[PDB]
Design a protein around this ligand. Sequence first.
Ligand code: NDP
Ligand code: SF4
Ligand code: SF4
Ligand code: SF4
Ligand code: ZN
Lengths: 55, 176, 156, 48, 43, 114, 63, 208, 52, 52, 297, 95
Amino acid sequence: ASATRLIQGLRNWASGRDLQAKLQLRYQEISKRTQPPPKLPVGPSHRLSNNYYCA
Amino acid sequence: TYKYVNLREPSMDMKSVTDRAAQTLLWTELIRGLGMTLSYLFREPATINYPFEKGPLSPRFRGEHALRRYPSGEERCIACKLCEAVCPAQAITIEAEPRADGSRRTTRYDIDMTKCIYCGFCQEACPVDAIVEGPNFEFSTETHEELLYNKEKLLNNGDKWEAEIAANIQADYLYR
Amino acid sequence: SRGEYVVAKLDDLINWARRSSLWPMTFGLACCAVEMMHMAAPRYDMDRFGVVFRASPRQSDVMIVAGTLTNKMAPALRKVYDQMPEPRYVVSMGSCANGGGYYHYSYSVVRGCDRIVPVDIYVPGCPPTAEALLYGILQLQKKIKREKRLRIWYRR
Amino acid sequence: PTVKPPTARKFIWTNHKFNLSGTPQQYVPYSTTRKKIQEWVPPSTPYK
Amino acid sequence: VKQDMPPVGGYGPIDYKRNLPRRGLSGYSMFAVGIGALLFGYW
Amino acid sequence: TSVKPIFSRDMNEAKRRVRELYRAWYREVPNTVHLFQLDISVKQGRDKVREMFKKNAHVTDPRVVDLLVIKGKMELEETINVWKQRTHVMRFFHETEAPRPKDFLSKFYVGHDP
Amino acid sequence: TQLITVDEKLDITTLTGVPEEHIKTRKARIFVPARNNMQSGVNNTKKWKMEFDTRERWENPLM
Amino acid sequence: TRPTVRPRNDVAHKQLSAFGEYVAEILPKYVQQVQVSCFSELEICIHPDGVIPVLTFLRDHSNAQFKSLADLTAVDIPTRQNRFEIVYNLLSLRFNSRIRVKTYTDELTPVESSVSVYKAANWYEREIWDMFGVFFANHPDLRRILTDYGFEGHPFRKDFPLSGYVELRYDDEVKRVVAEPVELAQEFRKFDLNSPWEAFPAYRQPPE
Amino acid sequence: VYDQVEFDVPIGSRGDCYDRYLCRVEEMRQSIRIISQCLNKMPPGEIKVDDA
Amino acid sequence: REKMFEFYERVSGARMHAAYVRPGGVHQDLPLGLMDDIYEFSKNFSLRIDEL
Amino acid sequence: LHHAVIPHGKGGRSSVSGIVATVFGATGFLGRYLVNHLGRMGSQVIVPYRCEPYDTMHLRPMGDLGQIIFMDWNGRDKDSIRRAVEHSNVVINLVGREWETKNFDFEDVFVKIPQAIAQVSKEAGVEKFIHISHLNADIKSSSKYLRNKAVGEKEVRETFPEATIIKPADIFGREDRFLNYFANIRSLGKKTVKQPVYIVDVTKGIINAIKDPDARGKTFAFVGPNRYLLFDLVQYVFAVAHRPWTTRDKVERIHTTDRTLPHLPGLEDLGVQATPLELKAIEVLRRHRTVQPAKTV
Amino acid sequence: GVRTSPTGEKVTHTGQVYDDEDYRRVRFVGRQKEVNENFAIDLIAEQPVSQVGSRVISCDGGGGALGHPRVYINLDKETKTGTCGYCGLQFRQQH
Ligand SMILES: NC(=O)C1=CN([C@@H]2O[C@H](COP(=O)(O)OP(=O)(O)OC[C@H]3O[C@@H](n4cnc5c(N)ncnc54)[C@H](OP(=O)(O)O)[C@@H]3O)[C@@H](O)[C@H]2O)C=CC1
Ligand code: SF4
Ligand code: SF4
Ligand code: SF4
Ligand SMILES: [Zn+2]
């Protein structure tokens, strides 16, 4: 994304496609490496009543 | 539900015939391939500068093994032999005896780093988070015998990498 | 004296030449060969260190054993190792080449490639990452740098 | 670690050491267990 | 509960079809260009 | 007690097959020695062939010796074509193996193995 | 008749590929395993097991 | 039993039972047993002499059309006097179905080769001969396919140990790779993990 | 859940290597299609079976 | 391919041999922010297939 | 006898043989064969090396894990010798050079170094010391090599009365300098008589001298089963090889006849059958290719 | 609390040290024997005992899910403190 406009134009002409729309090099658009802590849900068997294992 | 790759009949009118013959005689698609490889020349390469730049990793990464301690100096392993029972490669050897104050502690804890497949079953079978797979991966040795860790080597690895292993465990323990 | 200085400088020159043009051959046996291919990818770029991609066995310097060495494959490995010109080096990649790994107790797996060829660098992992094999290659370069062949020749 | 420093513990190394392979400080494996079978030391006095 | 989930409106478009630009002149145009270059050179 | 035969109905045709396999091995031993650049003579190879046939010579079941002839034929075909290397041919001769003691006293001296 | 008569004892030792000193010097033991006295379950005493005598185990000089 | 139990298919079970009756009634000369499992899989256990007719019928019948041979396997069960169980897995693309044909043989009895029906059987039963020592009569080219060139013994049998009888190492005196009797630095540790309590009462065997 | 996603199946016509290569390229495209559909239809809930 | 290996490592901790899909489901849940990266990668993969 | 030195196993690669051997000059040819024979039994081998470790790379795969210990040593430094031999129970001496150089002449190689090694191994309490001499060693010999070897043998015997002194005649093998010398010279024939001995027989004799408790203080002479003249030996070597570095000291040693010592015990007293040259000449000289046997006196 | 030997070899926390006449000390010649200088038995001895006013106490090692499984310790005996079986921490009743 640091390329000049002339190099971008030559690159797009020789490739035939708009390469700047879909760049293969990742930038600040991806998610952060530090995330807030999660809270995962529990399954259907996490019940206090009517939870007999033989059923 | 399905599609017909390569079932396009060629047109037989003079326009299509002259287009195909001009493509044959003047080498159009060869110029297309040349030009696109030229366009790929003028892009910034994806090469990082190792060892000054490192590839991205995750807190779940499985590298070198380590033995942890409680936040009082006492080691966490209580010689329950679950890690050597679950080890798919039989890389762990454990021998235990009661020590001087009667605690249940190991006297021998060997991990063969040439047998281990780095699968992480031991760190998830541990009930006390004693054995871990640390984030270190650059530990190549010049000798085979340097890859046969005893208890002292693993304890030293834990003391060396605690400040990172504890942070990775703090980041990941809510997904377990 | 003068002679020790001359042989020290010549040793530095030949070690710099040898360590900065390591041409590898790769035994594409198993998973670890796919990880070797991933170290030859644009991200890690083995070529930028002077380490070419897939050199011939008759002109390579370092031989990389990436995968499992079975009983049916070991004499071929020894035959390929014997034809390499000196100075030749061997790098063992992954647990299968280090000590057998997952298939250590198998009936048809050689328990380590060091039972067939001499091995200089052991790269641990299953598979060791491309970062780890790059580290092993650079450690091999460090090992080549501190060689003392001409000093040993002068002292003898 | 200038923003979020790690937790300070007394057993954590204060001096980080790099890969010591091929050095005199390299790791040498050994058995950490003691002897299993105890031998019979013969008496130092003659039977006379 | 907090979980890794898609958004309410989903994600954006993602292409999966072949895309070839079909650029350049026709057969007649390129043949005319070559013949004109030949005539200029011969002249 | 009736069983399905493999190739031989009784012992005579089985003995003929053993004879033919021995003739083929005896013929091929010089070519095997020459092509593989072995360090043995032709006589040592023929003695090894005869030793294997004599070791395997206490069997009276026609189907068992039919399977033995079949496996010997596979080994002979494996050697006629260059599929074995020099190590596979020389694995019949245990040169690097230490001589195992046989009498009681030496086995008593070296270990607990009976 | 596609069915021949073999009146000899069944012996397949020449085909198994086992070395002879692991045949003539080994003692097989055929037994029903004892119930473990630490447990009251009897599911492990249903099948016959055949095993072999224990040979020498020594200590590795390295580890 | 909704969330954590696998749902049961009954239409497929009925269809497979009907087709098992159909096959066992068309071929009574070789078919010995027909069963349909809990998860709707049809197994037809036949006599070893009728391997070619049963497979040719299942390949060529208008109501079978089992044109694909997926897998061919032998299983070693030492307590049976016919210890080897040879298993054919067939797939029918016309009816979108799968079938299993099982037969038995011991060490010394050969089995008729099914190369003349399915062409994958060539390499499949070459591997079966290599691993279990089961001879296949009327084979085009029967040799070893996976083991070492000088290997003695069949490794997938259950009396063959996990680690073999020989191991390879390079000897400098003879300048060659040599085979020696096997010695392990660490013995493979055997684990007795079987629980002494019965798990599934539905599979309980009657007492003697 | 492969019956809840929509995709096409590439079918060759000549049995050569070129048709198989085209089939693999089209399978890449259909895999991208299924990936987008799986992203848009991810449900909440637990990840292991609750039979402990 | 290296990007997809990064996805594998983020979800399991190993680049190639994840040992992630286990009988009963999967071993660990997806971390937060993974599917956005999957969406971006799949958004550009069409142009990657087009260039190949 | 310590508990860790009692032998165990079946004599394989992973076994324990109870032999802790320090092999000086193990980077050569006889030392290479001896380390190969020692490592396959499962013996602890200490290799003190002088050269680059790249040359000891070939010795590395000759034993199990932890069974070969490489360490640096100096010829004129007794501290390295004491560092090497203080934990072993047998010390083998194979230090030699066919030529003298600027830093080490024949008196340094054959007299001073064996004397220092034997004295240190005596002071370290080593039970067995084996020193490899030459057969034609004589105090009045015309060659400096044999005179210095005889002097060094006498010094080793006088400083270590329990030392075993071995006199090989002439050793031929894959990496030797005897048959490879004659094949590569493309030096003449005279009335010289020789009985060369195979390298494997010499190695087996050394191993059996280590094992046998009655070989302490003896002096063995290892010779081959056949005595050849020099001229027909050279002709036989040239005929086998399909062929129709040197010094004047090597010229003198070639033209020196192999002496006969019936009083000294040989290979037959250690239980070793000597291999004749006709069985191994093709193996040695197949590399030189691009036969009637020699006459035995 | 490391300890040395008359040989000069360090003694590990498990009590292992090679004998003086043992030949296996040759592996450390020119190299070093790695031991851990932090002895856990000496380190857990410095922790003060915690005094509580209940008949029983519960221990999870601190950190909740990041510790050991939660156990319950009885404090009926007055002659001795109650040591946790996992973490080694000891407790004493106030009365
Ligand atoms: N035909 C024969 O070979 C016979 C040999 N012998 C004796 O057997 C012994 C071994 O013979 P061989 O293998 O052929 O000879 P080599 O030259 O091949 O080996 C001699 C060894 O001694 C080492 N060495 C030589 N000089 C010195 C020195 N000044 N300081 C330290 N190490 C040194 C060499 O080490 P490096 O290469 O690292 O420098 C080498 O490993 C010798 O003592 C020789 O006299 C006796 C009779 C016959
Ligand atoms: S990561 Fe897996 S193979 Fe390695 S020690 Fe742990 S359980 Fe064993
Ligand atoms: S699972 Fe944990 S507590 Fe149990 S023996 Fe292994 S490391 Fe120790
Ligand atoms: S070490 Fe692991 S990744 Fe490498 S070849 Fe072996 S099984 Fe595959
Ligand atoms: Zn606690």
